Amino acid sequence: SSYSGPIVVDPVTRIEGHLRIEVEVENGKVKNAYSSSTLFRGLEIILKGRDPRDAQHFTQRTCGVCTYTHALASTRCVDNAVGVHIPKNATYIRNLVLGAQYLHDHIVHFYHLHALDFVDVTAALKADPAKAAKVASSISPRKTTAADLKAVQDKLKTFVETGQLGPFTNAYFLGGHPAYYLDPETNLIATAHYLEALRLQVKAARAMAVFGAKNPHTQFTVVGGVTCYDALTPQRIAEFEALWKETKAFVDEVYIPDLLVVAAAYKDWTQYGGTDNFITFGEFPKDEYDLNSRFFKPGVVFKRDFKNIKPFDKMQIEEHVRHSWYEGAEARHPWKGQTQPKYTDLHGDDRYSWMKAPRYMGEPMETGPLAQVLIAYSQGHPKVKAVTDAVLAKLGVGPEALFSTLGRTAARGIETAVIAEYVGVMLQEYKDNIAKGDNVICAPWEMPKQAEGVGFVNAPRGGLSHWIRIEDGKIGNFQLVVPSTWTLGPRCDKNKLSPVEASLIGTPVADAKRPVEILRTVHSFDPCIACGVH
Amino acid sequence: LMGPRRPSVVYLHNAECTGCSESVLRAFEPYIDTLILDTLSLDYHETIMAAAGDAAEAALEQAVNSPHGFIAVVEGGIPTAANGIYGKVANHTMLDICSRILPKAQAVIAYGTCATFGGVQAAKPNPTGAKGVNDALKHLGVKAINIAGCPPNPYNLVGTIVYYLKNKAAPELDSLNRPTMFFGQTVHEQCPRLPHFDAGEFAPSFESEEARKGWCLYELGCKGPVTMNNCPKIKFNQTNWPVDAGHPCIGCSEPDFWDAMTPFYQN
Ligand code: SF4
Ligand code: SF4
Ligand code: F3S
Ligand SMILES: [Mg+2]
Numbered sequence: 001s002s003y004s005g006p007i008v009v010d011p012v013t014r015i016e017g018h019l020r021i022e023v024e025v026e027n028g029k030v031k032n033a034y035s036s037s038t039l040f041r042g043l044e045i046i047l048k049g050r051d052p053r054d055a056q057h058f059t060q061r062t063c064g065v066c067t068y069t070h071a072l073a074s075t076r077c078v079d080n081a082v083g084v085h086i087p088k089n090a091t092y093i094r095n096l097v098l099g100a101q102y103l104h105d106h107i108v109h110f111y112h113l114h115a116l117d118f119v120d121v122t123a124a125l126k127a128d129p130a131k132a133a134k135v136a137s138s139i140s141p142r143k144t145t146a147a148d149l150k151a152v153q154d155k156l157k158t159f160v161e162t163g164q165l166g167p168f169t170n171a172y173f174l175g176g177h178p179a180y181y182l183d184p185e186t187n188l189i190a191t192a193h194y195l196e197a198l199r200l201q202v203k204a205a206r207a208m209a210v211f212g213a214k215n216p217h218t219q220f221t222v223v224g225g226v227t228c229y230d231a232l233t234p235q236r237i238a239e240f241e242a243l244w245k246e247t248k249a250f251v252d253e254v255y256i257p258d259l260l261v262v263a264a265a266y267k268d269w270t271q272y273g274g275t276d277n278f279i280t281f282g283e284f285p286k287d288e289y290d291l292n293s294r295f296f297k298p299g300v301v302f303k304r305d306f307k308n309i310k311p312f313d314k315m316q317i318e319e320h321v322r323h324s325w326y327e328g329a330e331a332r333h334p335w336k337g338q339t340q341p342k343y344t345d346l347h348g349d350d351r352y353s354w355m356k357a358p359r360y361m362g363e364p365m366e367t368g369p370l371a372q373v374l375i376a377y378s379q380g381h382p383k384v385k386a387v388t389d390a391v392l393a394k395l396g397v398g399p400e401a402l403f404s405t406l407g408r409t410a411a412r413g414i415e416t417a418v419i420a421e422y423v424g425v426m427l428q429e430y431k432d433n434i435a436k437g438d439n440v441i442c443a444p445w446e447m448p449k450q451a452e453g454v455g456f457v458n459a460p461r462g463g464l465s466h467w468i469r470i471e472d473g474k475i476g477n478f479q480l481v482v483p484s485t486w487t488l489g490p491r492c493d494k495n496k497l498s499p500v501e502a503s504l505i506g507t508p509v510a511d512a513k514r515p516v517e518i519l520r521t522v523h524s525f526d527p528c529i530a531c532g533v534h
Numbered sequence: 535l536m537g538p539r540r541p542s543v544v545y546l547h548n549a550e551c552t553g554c555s556e557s558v559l560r561a562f563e564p565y566i567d568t569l570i571l572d573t574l575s576l577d578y579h580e581t582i583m584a585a586a587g588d589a590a591e592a593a594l595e596q597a598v599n600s601p602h603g604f605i606a607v608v609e610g611g612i613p614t615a616a617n618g619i620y621g622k623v624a625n626h627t628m629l630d631i632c633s634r635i636l637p638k639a640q641a642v643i644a645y646g647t648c649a650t651f652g653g654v655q656a657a658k659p660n661p662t663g664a665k666g667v668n669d670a671l672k673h674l675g676v677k678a679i680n681i682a683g684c685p686p687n688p689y690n691l692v693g694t695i696v697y698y699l700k701n702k703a704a705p706e707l708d709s710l711n712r713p714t715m716f717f718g719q720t721v722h723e724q725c726p727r728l729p730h731f732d733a734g735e736f737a738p739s740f741e742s743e744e745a746r747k748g749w750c751l752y753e754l755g756c757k758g759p760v761t762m763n764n765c766p767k768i769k770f771n772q773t774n775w776p777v778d779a780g781h782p783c784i785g786c787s788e789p790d791f792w793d794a795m796t797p798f799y800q801n
Contacts, residue, residue, distance in 0.1 A: 008587065009586050009587040010587060010623070010624050010625060011580050011586060011587070011590055011623050011624060012586055012587070013580045013581070013582075013583050013584075013585065013586045013590055014580075014581065014582060014583070014584075014586070015581075016552045016581065017552065018547070018621070018622070018623055020625070038621070038622045038623065038625075039549055039613075039620070039621045039622070039628075040613075040620045040621070040662060041549055041620075041654070041655035041662065041664075042655065042661040042662060043654065043655070045659065045661050046654070046655070046657045046658065046659070046660075046661070046792075050796065050797075051796070051797040051798075051799075053797065053798065053799050054796055054797055054798050054799075057784055057798055058654060058657070058792065061551050061553065061653075061654040061684065062551060063551050063552065063553075064551045064552045064553020064554065064555070064556045064557075064685060065551075065552050065553075065556060067553055067556065108559075112582055113581075113582070116584045121584075155571065159571050162538060162539055162540070163536075163537060163538060164535065164536040164537060164538065164539070164540055164542075164575040164577075165535055165536075166535060166536070166570060166575050166576045166577060167570065167576055167579060167582050167583045167584060168583075168584050169535030169536075169577065169583070169584070169585060169593040169596070169597075170535070170584070170585040170589040170590070170592055170593045171584030171585055171589075172584065172585070172586075172589065173584075195567055198559070198565065198566055198567045199565055199567065201559065202559075202560055202561075202562065202565065202771075205556075205560055205771060206771040206772065206773055208771075209770055209771035209773050209774045210773055210774065211779070212774075212779060213770065213774050213775060213776045213778070213779030213781060214770030214771060214774060214775060214776065214779075215556075215560065215770070215771055216553040216556045216557055216560075216685055217553055217684060217685065219776040219779060219781045219784070220779045220780065220781055222740050222781070224740070224741065225740070225741070226780075227740050227745070227779060227780030227781040228779045228780045228781075229745065229746050229748070229780055230778065230779065230780070231779075239773065341620070341661065343616065343619050343620075346625070439746075440741070441741075442739075442740040442741040442745075443741060444739065444741055513588070513589075514589070515587070519586055530550070530551045530552060
């Protein structure tokens with residue numbers, strides 16, 4: 001029979017941060033899994049005693065992939081603690097920069113992090129560029145010719161012929177691999193668009209710097225609003241709008257059609273990587289103090305019961321440490337959080353990760369695009385319903401197909417397409433508000449000596465929350481509970497597998513030495529380990 | 535992964551947020567596809583490489599032992615407390631990995647304030663004993679060129695590499711081992727708000743009409759006067775930089791800036 005025994009993947013590449021995945025396989029299928037995060041920095045320890053205004057600058061450095069998101073969460077958190085209601089324009093500008101972040105992040109994830117699990121770049125060399133151009137022009141309104149793709153092929157040919165394969169060295173597809181299914185022409189189209197996406201993402205990121213100073217690590221948020229008076233000018237708005245329009249065209253005309261062609265070729269991937277429970281915090285508020293004012297609404301679902309979406313109660317979050325490298329075994333609500341590192345090595349005292357294990361009413365929760373999409377869909381979100389229905393119909397599958405590695409990957413595309421369109425709506429509202437004579441972008445505020453605050457962001461990987469306890473006007477406690485912590489943290493003190501661990505059970509492994517199927521599911525969650533551990 | 539025609543780059547990730555890697559993806563003229571296909575051979579890089587696990591480790595060994603030589607680019611600080619335990623890749627500590635690989639490089643570039651000077655995880659109380667590359671590896675003779683910033687301007691990385699490939703040597707470096715061609719001026723002496731500074735025209739708050747009109751941000755904490763970087767000159771993403779976005783400089787290309795420049799809104 002097939003392989004039986006352990007597989008270890010360390011490093012898991014094409015993620016952010018340092019992840020070790022361990023699985024036990026039996027007869028060619030995964031029967032057990034451990035998600036082990038192997039770097040700790042301790043930003044929560046470092047923040048103790050500092051000025052709450054300084055928190056966003058430190059916490060932004062939680063992660064430069066999901067850059068800006070933590071600055072936004074800490075600023076929302078200290079805005080909340082201080083009781084300031086920022087001006088409408090600060091809400092628009094913050095929301096527009098976050099929308100741009102999602103488009104950059106998801107485009108780079110699909111092409112530069114996920115697609116080498118499914119695309120054999122060297123097989124593109126054997127493709128017929130004329131055939132490939134016809135396929136590419138059939139799936140997109142954009143017209144692609146044989147010469148267009150030959151140019152890509154020629155460039156790849158000179159690259160491979162030098163013998164210096166660079167980032168493709170020892171790829172799992174080299175020489176062929178039974179779990180890689182694409183024909184040469186589809187591998188060429190995807191490879192062309194991988195290369196294209198390397199330059200398009202420059203524009204997508206630039207859109208953030210138009211208002212937000214720079215990418216990575218924006219520098220335009222303050223307690224009480226934003227600092228960028230230049231963001232009010234017609235010139236900056238026009239610059240942003242042109243970059244957004246080009247980024248949206250790429251999403252609509254290149255990314256989603258490629259996602260659909262690859263998903264169709266890998267329809268067996270509707271059978272692996274499903275999960276039970278979903279949490280999402282909502283995003284793009286009209287009111288900074290009301291989550292239900294967001295374009296996407298918060299919600300909680302247990303055991304895929306989308307007919308009974310539960311309200312999100314922020315007091316029902318606790319972070320477990322029994323299987324994590326921290327002192328003791330007591331789970332804590334983040335306003336009573338503890339970050340007390342204590343390393344025991346891999347599986348010492350049953351501990352195997354630097355991530356805590358967040359649980360909602362005791363349950364492990366997937367967060368991220370699949371949670372945001374399915375919950376919005378089930379709330380009747382018309383835009384989310386319209387494109388997920390079209391994706392389902394194009395693929396010829398039923399909604400059950402969404403509870404899988406394939407469905408998670410498709411949900412990341414659905415949310416990208418929906419957010420790309422909504423950024424235009426937000427831009428228009430912003431323009432309209434300026435036209436009414438509202439040029440205010442920052443509000444005054446005062447620091448309380450004692451306060452509690454929380455800030456909620458639905459980031460490209462899911463529900464992000466920052467929690468502060470202010471004591472003597474300083475940071476008494478600052479806790480980050482980050483989307484990858486939910487999804488990729490370890491087991492809790494009830495020994496419940498986290499979403500990634502549980503999703504790996506059942507994974508087939510054709511070749512234990514090149515376990516691309518494990519990577520396909522792990523990458524579908526878009527792990528960020530600097531985020532998860534901080 | 536390599537040998538011949540293009541110079542081999544081994545890119546390591548220690549204790550880092552991956553913002554420095556993202557900054558290189560923003561490379562402009564040349565863009566990152568030209569860089570990876572034409573200029574350089576990128577032979578190890580955990581964020582974007584195809585291989586994982588054992589296959590990735592084999593790719594790394596093959597690149598570092600190549601008879602053709604490699605250049606190392608290092609992102610992130612090295613955690614040294616508790617014998618390096620706080621950071622491991624392939625179940626090796628980052629301290630050990632860098633100890634074994636970086637002395638074999640023909641040249642080492644520390645990219646970003648974490649790799650140059652220790653960075654965010656080295657801020658007080660530094661629970662993981664994080665250190666910059668040259669501090670951590672002093673005893674081994676490693677002297678990395680330091681390209682500072684959080685993250686640095688990618689113009690500064692590509693310019694340093696191109697220099698090095700041309701001249702077979704480091705450019706002139708300052709006393710923090712940073713190239714003077716990029717770090718020789720304060721961001722303040724380059725700043726468009728300098729005439730307001732000279733006139734004592736300071737914004738007293740971010741909501742004020744003075745801030746709306748572009749007055750100097752020094753009273754609001756700007757660290758431009760004590761920070762060396764080329765931000766106002768090169769800008770970021772071909773379009774902006776912190777004080778043109780109305781926010782003070784937080785000093786992010788200086789050693790220990792998380793503790794030296796804080797509170798960020800005071801001077
Ligand atoms: S220097 Fe800044 S941007 Fe670069 S890895 Fe460190 S924290 Fe991230
Ligand atoms: S805004 Fe900052 S860098 Fe510019 S003149 Fe004022 S102190 Fe100097
Ligand atoms: S914060 Fe850093 S990016 Fe430049 S403007 Fe100051 S050195
Ligand atoms: Mg935390």
